[PDB]
Amino acid sequence: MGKAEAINEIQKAVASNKVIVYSKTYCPYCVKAKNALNQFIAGKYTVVELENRADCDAMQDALLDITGGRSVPRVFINGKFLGGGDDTAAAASNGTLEKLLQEAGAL
Ligand code: NA
Ligand code: NA
């Protein structure tokens, strides 16, 4: 369960879920992203919490390789990285989160 495996896992999950958030339970920016998504699709999307993953470091290293940054949250829609918590809240506020969810078939 090293970094190469984590990259594999994340890429497969991102390609196979309309909306997926990599998160940790104690994380106010993760909550900002979740609350933004919950304005449109509460209860319908995947969250992967990382704080009790034995391979949490490899998973966050994999997120860096895939998205450019290591921090949670890391939000993906329709297989494409959206951003973190501020990004997801901004997209909720400006009308684009709804449109991206529609285009993904999640809404
Ligand atoms: Na969904
Ligand atoms: Na966990």
Author numbering: 1 to 107
Q: What do the paper's sentences say?
A:
Glutaredoxins (GRXs) are thioredoxin superfamily members exhibiting thiol-disulfide oxidoreductase activity and/or iron-sulfur (Fe-S) cluster binding capacities. CrGRX2 is a class I GRX member that possesses a classical YCPYC signature with two cysteine residues present at positions 27 and 30, whereas a third, non-conserved, cysteine is present at position 56. In conclusion, using the roGFP2 as a model protein substrate, we showed that CrGRX2 catalyzes both protein glutathionylation and deglutathionylation reactions in the presence of GSSG and GSH, respectively. In addition, this work demonstrates that C. reinhardtii GRX2 has the capacity to bind a [2Fe–2S] cluster despite having the canonical CPYC active site signature that was shown to prevent Fe–S cluster binding in some other GRXs.
The crystal structure of CrGRX2 was solved at a high-resolution using synchrotron radiation (1.5 Å, CrGRX2red) while a lower resolution was obtained using a laboratory source (2.4 Å, CrGRX2SS). Both crystals were isomorphous and the structures were highly similar (root-mean-square deviation (r.m.s.d.) of 0.10 Å for the superimposition of 107 pairs of Cα atoms). Only one difference was noted: Cys27 and Cys30 form a disulfide bond in the CrGRX2SS structure while they were reduced in CrGRX2red. The equivalent distance of 3.2 Å in the CrGRX2red structure indicates that the disulfide bond was most likely broken during the synchrotron data collection. CrGRX2 crystallized in space group P3221 with a single molecule of CrGRX2 (Met1-Leu107 residues) per asymmetric unit. The overall fold of CrGRX2 showed four mixed β-strands in a central core structure surrounded by five α-helices. The four-stranded β-sheet is sandwiched by α-helices α1 and α3 on one side and α-helices α2, α4, and α5 on the other side. We found an acetate molecule originating from the crystallization medium at the position usually occupied by the carboxylic acid group of the γ-glutamyl moiety of GSH. The amine groups of Gly85 and Asp86, located just after two conserved glycine residues forming a structural kink, help stabilizing the acetate ion through hydrogen bonding.
